[PDB]
Amino acid sequence: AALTEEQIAEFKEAFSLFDKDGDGTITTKELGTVMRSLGQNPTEAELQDMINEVDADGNGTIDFPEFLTMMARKMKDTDSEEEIREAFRVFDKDGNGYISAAELRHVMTNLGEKLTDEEVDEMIREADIDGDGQVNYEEFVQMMTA
């Protein structure tokens, strides 16, 4: 919980992803705008709570000092291998740990933001390790998180 000076200049750049008006402070309305642009729908109270756990002076908004301080307490990261495996499992229709290459192409070209058929070709080339037209997604996820 002690920040490198490198990272201080880094989080100032981060601060502007949040301070939608260059105000020098982050309000709940800006935090809601940001949260919603990441696909989340926090309530007004949840936004106030987020600010309130960071707002040292109690003026209802987050300055860069309180922003930068609250990063220092959450620098610890952990791997996402199991969460990514569970996203693949969503498409494991038979729950047998395999997704066919055809089905993975169908998913990647139709759901979410999508990939081009060319992009999906490279992904399946890596994903179908055994060349059998089937993706053992735990093994593929292990390869990508190595």
Next chain:
Amino acid sequence: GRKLELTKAEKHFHNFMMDTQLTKRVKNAAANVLRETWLIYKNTKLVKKIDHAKVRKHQRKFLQAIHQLRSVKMEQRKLNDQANTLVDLAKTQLE
């Protein structure tokens, strides 16, 4: 770089009780858990004749308090992941 790692989720819940409503809810609901646990135990094990309507009453209030506590616990986990979302977004400037 960080690759596919994301901010680690918090251990115990020493946080977001800055929300005065949540901490009021926790303490009222916890006290009611204590209250109905006592009253159920007394009414089943410390009496000569069990009054089943009394037990049902305190079972309703007990489940109500337990589930209020659960709903506070889930809200704290949601608040923590909402904050971890912003930490994770801020951390993308370290690359």
